[PDB]
Design a binder for this molecule. Structure first.
Ligand SMILES: [Mg+2]
Ligand SMILES: [Mg+2]
Ligand SMILES: [Mg+2]
Ligand SMILES: [Mg+2]
Ligand SMILES: [Mg+2]
Ligand SMILES: [Mg+2]
Ligand SMILES: [Mg+2]
Ligand SMILES: [Mg+2]
Ligand SMILES: [Mg+2]
Ligand SMILES: [Mg+2]
Ligand SMILES: [Mg+2]
Ligand SMILES: [Mg+2]
Ligand SMILES: [Mg+2]
Ligand SMILES: [Mg+2]
Ligand SMILES: [Mg+2]
Ligand SMILES: [Mg+2]
Ligand SMILES: [Mg+2]
Ligand SMILES: [Mg+2]
Ligand SMILES: [Mg+2]
Ligand SMILES: [Mg+2]
Ligand SMILES: [Mg+2]
Ligand SMILES: [Mg+2]
Ligand SMILES: [Mg+2]
Ligand SMILES: [Mg+2]
Ligand SMILES: [Mg+2]
Ligand SMILES: [Mg+2]
Ligand SMILES: [Mg+2]
Ligand SMILES: [Mg+2]
Ligand SMILES: [Mg+2]
Ligand SMILES: [Mg+2]
Ligand SMILES: [Mg+2]
Ligand SMILES: [Zn+2]
Ligand SMILES: [Zn+2]
Lengths: 48, 79, 182, 136, 49
RNA sequence: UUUCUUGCCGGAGGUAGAGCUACUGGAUGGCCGAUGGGCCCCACAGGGUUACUGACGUCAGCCAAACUCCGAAUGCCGGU
RNA sequence: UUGCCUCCUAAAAUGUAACGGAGGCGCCCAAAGGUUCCCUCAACCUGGACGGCAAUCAGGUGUUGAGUGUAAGUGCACAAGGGAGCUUGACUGCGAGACGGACAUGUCGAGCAGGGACGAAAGUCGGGACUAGUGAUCCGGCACCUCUGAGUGGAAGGGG
């Protein structure tokens, strides 16, 4: 874990379009994402 | 009608200079060589051109130490 | 006081799953995932040395760590490639950055595939070290679309303690990896 | 002609031509063979002539094994020239033969024709040889 | 020459103590290194003449 | 007597010989069989058939002043 | 062709000739020098978008077949091979004892002191894995020195 050379990394809140809530961490300076196709949206993931 | 070769260099007189059981002074050089064909042993040092010399007075004796031919100087007893 | 969630679910249910359906004498023989390696093998940078910059930037934003620049340790006449030329960039992820990156990929980025049809189950190197590629860096939402300059594929490797593809595949499925069903 | 594709050194010393053949003294490929009795330099000219002789005599079906190879070059300095000015250019090829070495080996159904083809070959060689059978 | 002979002189006494070689194509500027000065008695910088 | 000879003891070698599946090269005949060759159904997918050429490998017999996994006799250095 | 270096001839110490058989040299590197620490290649199989045996990634097999500035030989995996940090010992005063030797050349060297570099310390360091990359004396140039200075003081000139 170096001093400051790595890109900024903070906890982030990810909300799905179909209503799933992901509690994660990313390099997003905002820390907030909403996604319309997720693990419960794709026809291949949930068979729909 | 001419040979494109015919050159050679001087012989460097390499080889073992003191053999086993031979009493030497401290500092005598004992074997002249190119690589490390004989590795420095106990109380024997190695020179810049890989020349083995004696770091103490005694008798020369060769050995093998983990698959390496080595040269050692053995302290003869003082009369 | 805080842990990644997917590692939590792993320990909670996948460990018992792997134990009870693979039946190890030692509870420590229950396998698991060890590391992931993302490699952008750029290679064509033998002329454009400036493309590796976008390579390392986008890979850093997705992975959260700054790649080591991988040079070329051979001299070859064809590709205009000399020794010591930056050719690729790699990051290894272990631990919390490990699990969080796996989240960002499989729950987010891997859904973002256009024309997705799964990932082949025969993609193991004999012992369960699963390695797959792709050809577009625009399935990662960490990067905006127009902000890209060239279409680039990553190189995603998951290295696990499988003894063979059975442990590797059982693990990857148990972790929630949408394979191709052959 | 039997010529090596390349030799590491193209001007060697004359092969030492003393002793008894230690390696290669048994008949192993075919059933009859020609087995040497004198030291010599069997050039590829001799080998080719002998092989063609065997093939002409048997002429039907049977295997001829030339288990010696001419791969040692003898040089010769150009004519009318004095001594000196270095070694010549290699211009013939040789197998070094000791007394004991099976030179040619033959596999063929009958006996007398095989023996006659082998002696037809022997007549083309610069040495004394003898026909040796697959058994002690 | 591309690897000419050069001399090194102590700054604090201006005595030329060492002569060496260096590549002018690779070291265009004067070479300076901390060498030993026999009359200054200690290690001093030495600069190309 | 330091010289020399003979016996014994302590040494370092890479020659003769030999060996090579121990290296570098040469090199004989088999064996399986590729990749790359041709064809069928017919696609340049895929599959098999065929003097295919036949990588690699492997069986057996060999070769070398500038080869060596090995390896003397003599000579040489020292001691006694 | 003529000096130097490496190998074979060269007959297991050293040395050994020919218009005998093969090649190199007349450099290069302020790091490719010093020290401290860390690492192990080449090739092969398997899995991967460009990417094809081949480029970078991952797993395995892999004790030396890779590499060592540069010919060849002897070496080196304990690494002398790959990587990073600091740094100038690519030192000054010397040198017991030796190898080689017609002579003149040449070559190795522990150890002492000064002043340093690296290292916690032990210690190592008087260029480079080693053996080529060089030219005697005369004569002259230059910088420094506490020497000399043709009656004396300087100077010129000589000397180290
Ligand atoms: Mg020589
Ligand atoms: Mg040295
Ligand atoms: Mg002989
Ligand atoms: Mg025999
Ligand atoms: Mg033999
Ligand atoms: Mg006859
Ligand atoms: Mg520089
Ligand atoms: Mg005696
Ligand atoms: Mg004896
Ligand atoms: Mg012996
Ligand atoms: Mg030899
Ligand atoms: Mg022999
Ligand atoms: Mg050869
Ligand atoms: Mg020999
Ligand atoms: Mg000799
Ligand atoms: Mg001899
Ligand atoms: Mg002579
Ligand atoms: Mg020349
Ligand atoms: Mg070095
Ligand atoms: Mg250094
Ligand atoms: Mg590997
Ligand atoms: Mg090193
Ligand atoms: Mg110097
Ligand atoms: Mg002296
Ligand atoms: Mg000191
Ligand atoms: Mg010293
Ligand atoms: Mg030196
Ligand atoms: Mg004169
Ligand atoms: Mg006067
Ligand atoms: Mg006066
Ligand atoms: Mg004056
Ligand atoms: Zn969704
Ligand atoms: Zn000074």
């Amino acid at each position: 874990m170096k001093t400051g050379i790595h890109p900024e990394y903070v906890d982030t809140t990810v909300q799905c379009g179909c209503g799933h809530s992901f509690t994660t961490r990313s390099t997003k300076q905002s820390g907030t994402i909403v996604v319309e196709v997720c693990s419960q949206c794709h026809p291949f993931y949930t068979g729909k | 009608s001419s040979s494109r070769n015919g050159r050679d260099s001087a012989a460097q007189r390499l080889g073992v200079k003191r053999f086993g059981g031979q009493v030497v002074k401290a500092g005598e050089i004992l074997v002249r060589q190119r690589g490390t064909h004989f590795h420095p042993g106990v109380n024997v040092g190695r020179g810049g051109d890989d020349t083995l010399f004696a770091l103490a007075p005694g008798a020369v004796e060769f050995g093998a130490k983990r698959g390496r031919k080595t040269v050692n100087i053995v302290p003869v007893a003082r009369p | 006081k805080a842990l990644p969630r997917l590692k939590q679910r792993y320990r909670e249910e996948i460990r018992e799953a792997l134990q009870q359906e693979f039946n190890y004498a030692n509870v420590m023989q229950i396998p698991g995932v060890v590391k992931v390696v993302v490699n952008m093998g750029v290679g064509d940078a033998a002329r454009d040395a400036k493309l590796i910059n976008g390579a390392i930037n986008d890979l850093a934003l997705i992975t959260g760590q700054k790649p080591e620049v991988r040079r070329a340790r051979k001299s070859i006449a064809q590709f205009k490639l000399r020794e010591g030329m930056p050719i690729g960039a790699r990051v290894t992820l272990r631990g919390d950055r490990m699990w969080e990156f796996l989240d960002r990929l499989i729950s987010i980025a891997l859904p973002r595939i256009r024309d997705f049809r799964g990932l082949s189950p025969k993609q193991f190197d004999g012992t369960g070290n699963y390695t797959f590629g792709l050809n577009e860096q625009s399935m990662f939402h960490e990067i905006d679309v127009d902000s890209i300059d060239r279409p680039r594929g990553m190189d995603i490797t998951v290295v696990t303690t499988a003894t063979n593809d059975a442990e590797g595949r059982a693990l990857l499925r148990a972790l929630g990896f949408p394979f191709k069903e052959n | 002609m039997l010529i090596p594709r390349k030799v590491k050194h193209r001007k060697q010393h004359h092969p030492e031509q003393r002793g008894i053949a230690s390696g290669g003294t048994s008949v192993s490929f075919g059933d009859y063979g020609i087995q040497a009795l004198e030291h010599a330099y069997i050039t590829n000219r001799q080998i080719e002539s002998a092989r063609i002789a065997i093939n002409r005599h048997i002429k039907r079906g049977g295997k001829v094994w030339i288990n010696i190879f001419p791969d040692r070059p003898l040089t010769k300095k150009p004519a009318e020239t004095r001594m000196g000015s270095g070694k010549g250019s290699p211009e013939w090829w040789v197998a070094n033969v000791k007394p004991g070495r099976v030179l040619f080996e033959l596999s063929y159904p009958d006996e007398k024709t095989a023996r006659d083809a082998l002696t037809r070959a022997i007549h083309k060689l610069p040495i004394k040889a003898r026909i040796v059978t697959r058994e002690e | 020459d591309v690897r000419p002979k050069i001399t090194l002189a102590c700054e604090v006494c201006k005595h030329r103590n060492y002569i060496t070689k260096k590549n002018r194509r690779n070291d265009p500027d004067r070479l300076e290194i901390k060498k030993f000065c026999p009359n200054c008695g200690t290690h001093q910088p030495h600069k190309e003449s």
